[PDB]
Amino acid sequence: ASGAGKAIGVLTSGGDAQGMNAAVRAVTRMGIYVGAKVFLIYEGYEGLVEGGENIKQANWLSVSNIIQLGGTIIGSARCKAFTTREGRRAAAYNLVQHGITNLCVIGGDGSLTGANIFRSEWGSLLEELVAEGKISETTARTYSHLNIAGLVGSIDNDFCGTDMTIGTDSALHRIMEVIDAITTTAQSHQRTFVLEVMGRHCGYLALVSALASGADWLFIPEAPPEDGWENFMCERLGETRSRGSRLNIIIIAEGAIDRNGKPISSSYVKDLVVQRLGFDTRVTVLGHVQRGGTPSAFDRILSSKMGMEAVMALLEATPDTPACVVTLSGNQSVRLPLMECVQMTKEVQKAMDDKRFDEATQLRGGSFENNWNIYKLLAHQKPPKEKSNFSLAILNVGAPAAGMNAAVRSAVRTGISHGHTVYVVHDGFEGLAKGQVQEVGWHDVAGWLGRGGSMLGTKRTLPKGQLESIVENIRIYGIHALLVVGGFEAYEGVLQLVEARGRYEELCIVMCVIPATISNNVPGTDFSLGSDTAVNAAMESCDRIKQSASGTKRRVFIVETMGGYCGYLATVTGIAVGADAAYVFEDPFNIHDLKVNVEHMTEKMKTDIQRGLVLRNEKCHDYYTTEFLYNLYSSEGKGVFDCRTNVLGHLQQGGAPTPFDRNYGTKLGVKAMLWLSEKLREVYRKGRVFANAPDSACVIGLKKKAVAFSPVTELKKDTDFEHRMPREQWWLSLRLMLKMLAQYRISMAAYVSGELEHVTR
Amino acid sequence: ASGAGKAIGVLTSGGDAQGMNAAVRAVTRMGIYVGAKVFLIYEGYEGLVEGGENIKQANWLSVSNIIQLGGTIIGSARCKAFTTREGRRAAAYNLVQHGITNLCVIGGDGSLTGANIFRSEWGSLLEELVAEGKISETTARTYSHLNIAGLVGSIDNDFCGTDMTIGTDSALHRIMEVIDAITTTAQSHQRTFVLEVMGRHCGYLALVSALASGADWLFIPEAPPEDGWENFMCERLGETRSRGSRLNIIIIAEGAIDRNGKPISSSYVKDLVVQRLGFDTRVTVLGHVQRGGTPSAFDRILSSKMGMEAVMALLEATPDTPACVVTLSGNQSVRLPLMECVQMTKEVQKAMDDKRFDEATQLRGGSFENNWNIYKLLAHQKPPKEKSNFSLAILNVGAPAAGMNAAVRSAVRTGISHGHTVYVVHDGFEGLAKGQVQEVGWHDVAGWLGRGGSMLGTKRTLPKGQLESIVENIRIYGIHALLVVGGFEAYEGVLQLVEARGRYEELCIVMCVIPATISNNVPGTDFSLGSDTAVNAAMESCDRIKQSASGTKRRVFIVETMGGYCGYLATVTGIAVGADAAYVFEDPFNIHDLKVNVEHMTEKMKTDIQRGLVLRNEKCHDYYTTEFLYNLYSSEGKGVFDCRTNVLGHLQQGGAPTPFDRNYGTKLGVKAMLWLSEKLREVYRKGRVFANAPDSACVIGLKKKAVAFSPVTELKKDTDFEHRMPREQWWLSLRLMLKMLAQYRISMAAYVSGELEHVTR
């Protein structure tokens, strides 16, 4: 099973997508964990060509304390030698000199194209190399096959076969930090903010940025503006002013073009707006800022997961299997052949070269086209000449979660677009019982994207107590559908209302649960809306804490995280920050395990690494509290390290939503409203809505691959109501990755890696 | 004493410098605290002109929960009507209709120029108004004098009479957050970062940004580059590359020009760099981002302080006293006449228009010229043809503090410039005993500015125990001076060496203490190096915590800050966050005070405000711990509010230094080295150095107005060694501002306001 006797090479090439260091760390540590030798190739294909000093064998400490660093400690370089066979043969020679039959390439589309051409010629290159006399025929029959596992490290997301790439999320963090500097201020005078992103080839960053910020206008190369857009844009900004909206946002990609090949410059759009509107227009150009900063939490977890799965795929790969790219489509890990992804990239580039240009956007991926349609729909209120007698109420139930407001905004716009009479109830089930129902318009949710918490009030009170009041208010207001955006209390309350359909006719209405909670404890989803924000705030506090020892004092920090009994937040935060241990309820531990971990920490702390970090979920143990672990570690570490404690309380809670959470809540809010409208038409009968089947009350998912609708009655089997969490949680396999990255010898036979899948046309 | 029967108008005009909301809040609450009526004039001089709906009377809650908001809730507008007498008469009319004889103007240079011309014509405008028949002669003899207290709210810092303006620090926060995105990554390949700041008229932001980031080159309009700078810059970048420095930073102001009037564009410098060097050059233009984001901690405190002092100056102002600008020169509040400051601004503008252009930079202020010289000195190693037999060792003692590295970097460069042999010892006095002395060069401190903590080790151990080893190592290495960068332990250790001079001849060496600690507990200074960083981290945590309720539940948060017995950090943090109470050791409080505060909180919590925040210093009370206050507030608040607790541990410690701390530590490190060189030349006699007088061992200050050098022996009188803090601390008067902003009726007769001072030529 173990990959002993074989060597793995890891290199980074292209633009240094932040989170590359997390991928390199996971690749290295998994490679020497399974017994293989790991060789770090510095400067990418450059050091591959020159070789020699640029190829060094890695130990465990070579990738120590890099997960929080952006860029790449390996370094990346553009080399033209790898383009030509003269340098590529030298690269093959230097790999053979170290017995590196396994190569992991972390880079963009050009990097992976070079890796594909390098595999395709590996046999021919070895033949020409032995022919020229630099390697004997023996020692060339071995190493006859080169194994390539690709990782898409780039901010462009231009690699067509893959949905999400390393560094896209963090580039979005940089972009939205800049936009939030503008929008969160008390907007005082009429001004126009024109943001220029570096999406020269791919406009994905421009698109998701526009969606996350609610941009008034978007210039992306995939969909250039129609002729006469000059007037159409200026009029849009004009009515925006007439509304009283004091700030317009124009997101212009670097590759912005018109229907011809002529590019549209940010300076042109600036001067255009200034001339016709007179708004204070200034162009913000991020430039290198997009590649800068720390990697986001998402980038660290996903880079670590994909680096591990890259190594595992690199060991189970026989001479026959092709070069693969380890990526995630949705939440599911998958391997795609490198050749097909390169071919699709070439097809989209040719299409974008005025061949099938209007039909190139679909080949970019369904996510791009769907994102652009959602953006345009939510941007400007088109007239819904369609009307329906249906009306729906949007609830916010439970704790506040970052991204509830984004979901409510999208739900409101999409429902108004379908002609539904959208209501918002303040304080959730409390207000629904109290009749705090308020008919909502398009502009009443204006600017709700970036606001954290909940603009509607949240209450945890379940509907069972005031059920007579809830059904009375549903009857009075004629509510035909009920959109409940919230945590476990939201799911449980919808479950109670569904179970009470047996008693109350008025509760035979379509219900939908959007899981939105910090704990990620809602059954029927992988990511509760706002768990990403909490993880990001948690790691940032942990990174601050770990940085406070200042490279000299040997100190361990016991950091207590929230999440109730659900350990998701603690474990992922531990992966993101390189925590030594993340104690959680789902992995019960006794004093024997504590002594094992403490002795492990002491041994680690005698080496070069001086800042330890253990996370504790707030409800992981009845007796081994944070104070208990503090006393244990400080006593046993006496004469080696000091111990400190930090209970991250509501620091993990009140933040603005991360860009992932905004886009996520935006999209599933749209999808929830689409599903609501479809179910309401499917269920309207004899002059009224009568929704009584269990499939008419679902939790909107994202369960493995795509968005799902799990009926609450079906989820009740797999729900631990006492602990308010699901019985089977997808993320328990990530404990093994945490423990492996912390030098815990754990037999991870229970970890399942994504299998090969062909590209979806 | 109280200002009853009189009305104050507050308006904001010009670019919405963040921290305006803090100043407006303090102006309003001080105005209605002292009994005066406060009127909020919306859109600035615009609403002054039109009046009517744009002038609304303020209550205490009208400016509630705005201190953390950037921009201005009042709103600012550019109006040309106030330029002309037609609109200025209407403005005088609208002020007379409300009996507003008192006007506070928060704005830039143009705002304060308009306020000056409005005062100068106030009598003539009233005469013409009564002549035209819109006000009777009676009701015009009253209001015959208009009182103006100006506040400089702008990112430009173009107002010459003032040293620091509201929003400068926060604009610098935005700039440096963008630069830290670039510098904190693993620099993978050679790239050039060209940052464009909006300093169209003033290049102060460009300059301080360059100093804080260690920019390789700076284009500022105050000192345009000499002819042929094209080659000189490209060579500088060339040797920067040859060093192995992989990142070059070019800060170009928007108003960048050459010796002639031709502007230098960021695009021009880009294409120039690309052409001659081939580095990956991208231009970052911040644009509106500089005005964005939250105001920094410094901006919130200083805005509140100057807003309060503006109101007080507006009430103690008779018909004869002139229009004033409330500003701080150094740490001291001061009032400067509006006419002289406007006149100086006009003189500098005429000078910059090719009149006295080479001598316009000095009229900008001594701080600008000094900052530019320090920047150029530290930027590029010029050849020090001078040499001296003197040699000095730089220590880091105590806890790590953000900005120690900036101080050590400047000290090393400045010492090398004067020909001194600079040593750095790791682990402070422990290393000095252990002989961990390493001679250091120019490039050994490269990139130390933005790194928090301490590159050199820090230890708290005082030198008395191992004094024999210290004197032995001083003799071996020939250490003629000692620069100790650290907290109270640094000062105490230097005091011990000074007192031990009588026993050991070798300890008769010039010593200097740079106060560097989180607590700001070092006697001899007002701001310890890195206290600002801790305050900023603490408020960011407190702001996040206060946002965690998200307007639904009403909750009080007990946040515990660090600082030992020194309460500075708690109190300033409470001011910045609008904390209801900041419990500190220096203001002893009993259970009676706690009941008063809790009842006050309960009464407030029944009003519109829903999020309470009371800070507690970690060592304020022996028995009334954080758990005690949690129990008290949660019990007494039963049925009104819930209580929660968050002990900010090392979250206030490990952060990277704020731009203030970098510039501060940079400058005082230079000044400490200048003072060291002067003292060592004054003490060198008989062929050897013999420093026996008390003046040879001083703590570098910044004590009231400018930098001072207090001998440690003289400061021993005003030192509480048991509690490790000074006995008389300047900041105890800020408690009264905190309490007043929190609705506590406290007789602040002990607060001293800056008196009138003429401009310093």
Ligand SMILES: Nc1ncnc2c1ncn2[C@@H]1O[C@H](COP(=O)(O)OP(=O)(O)OP(=O)(O)O)[C@@H](O)[C@H]1O
């Ligand atoms: N068709 C190719 N054949 C061989 N090598 C290639 C090919 N394309 C790119 N490379 C190599 O990969 C390196 C980097 O590729 P590229 O310039 O496209 O950046 P990237 O991976 O796409 O990252 P990013 O999109 O963010 O800029 C190139 O310097 C080149 O050496």
Ligand SMILES: Nc1ncnc2c1ncn2[C@@H]1O[C@H](COP(=O)(O)OP(=O)(O)OP(=O)(O)O)[C@@H](O)[C@H]1O
């Ligand atoms: N927020 C926006 N950003 C960028 N382009 C936009 C936006 N809204 C509309 N457009 C562009 O303006 C063009 C016409 O707009 P409009 O929606 O009014 O007519 P349409 O027939 O419905 O176009 P379509 O349905 O294909 O998007 C579209 O091609 C679209 O690309």
Ligand SMILES: Nc1ncnc2c1ncn2[C@@H]1O[C@H](COP(=O)(O)OP(=O)(O)OP(=O)(O)O)[C@@H](O)[C@H]1O
């Ligand atoms: N983080 C925030 N907190 C509080 N208020 C905010 C925040 N961001 C924006 N706003 C407010 O929302 C208001 C509505 O205008 P906004 O620019 O935000 O959205 P919009 O462009 O007008 O419409 P849409 O949301 O569909 O894009 C703004 O005036 C602003 O005061």
Ligand SMILES: Nc1ncnc2c1ncn2[C@@H]1O[C@H](COP(=O)(O)OP(=O)(O)OP(=O)(O)O)[C@@H](O)[C@H]1O
């Ligand atoms: N010399 C002046 N006389 C009369 N009014 C003036 C004068 N200068 C400025 N004002 C008034 O103050 C307003 C603001 O001026 P301006 O647009 O030039 O920015 P600013 O005053 O310099 O502030 P900021 O530093 O933020 O940029 C103007 O609209 C004008 O009404």
Ligand SMILES: Nc1ncnc2c1ncn2[C@@H]1O[C@H](COP(=O)(O)OP(=O)(O)OP(=O)(O)O)[C@@H](O)[C@H]1O
């Ligand atoms: N880091 C820098 N950024 C921008 N301009 C610089 C920098 N260093 C030097 N210069 C400019 O280059 C010119 C000459 O530089 P240099 O310091 O080497 O000679 P100098 O005679 O000593 O000038 P200076 O009066 O500043 O000491 C000066 O006009 C100076 O303004």
Ligand SMILES: Nc1ncnc2c1ncn2[C@@H]1O[C@H](COP(=O)(O)OP(=O)(O)OP(=O)(O)O)[C@@H](O)[C@H]1O
């Ligand atoms: N916040 C930081 N943390 C850790 N390392 C850093 C940080 N900033 C810079 N560095 C590292 O310090 C190294 C020194 O090079 P750097 O370009 O940053 O400074 P420099 O311009 O060459 O010197 P100078 O301060 O005089 O301007 C960089 O290669 C970088 O890796």
Ligand SMILES: O=P(O)(O)OC[C@H]1O[C@](O)(COP(=O)(O)O)[C@@H](O)[C@@H]1O
């Ligand atoms: O119950 P949820 O849905 O998991 O809400 C998450 C929040 O609730 C908590 O239990 C704590 O909430 P409270 O501070 O209000 O008591 C934490 O898990 C987290 O801060």
Ligand SMILES: O=P(O)(O)OC[C@H]1O[C@](O)(COP(=O)(O)O)[C@@H](O)[C@@H]1O
């Ligand atoms: O000793 P100083 O100079 O006051 O340093 C301040 C820091 O030291 C502290 O006492 C905490 O130190 P420790 O973490 O080692 O216990 C806090 O007051 C603060 O974080």
Ligand SMILES: [Mg+2]
């Ligand atoms: Mg690419």
Ligand SMILES: [Mg+2]
């Ligand atoms: Mg101005």
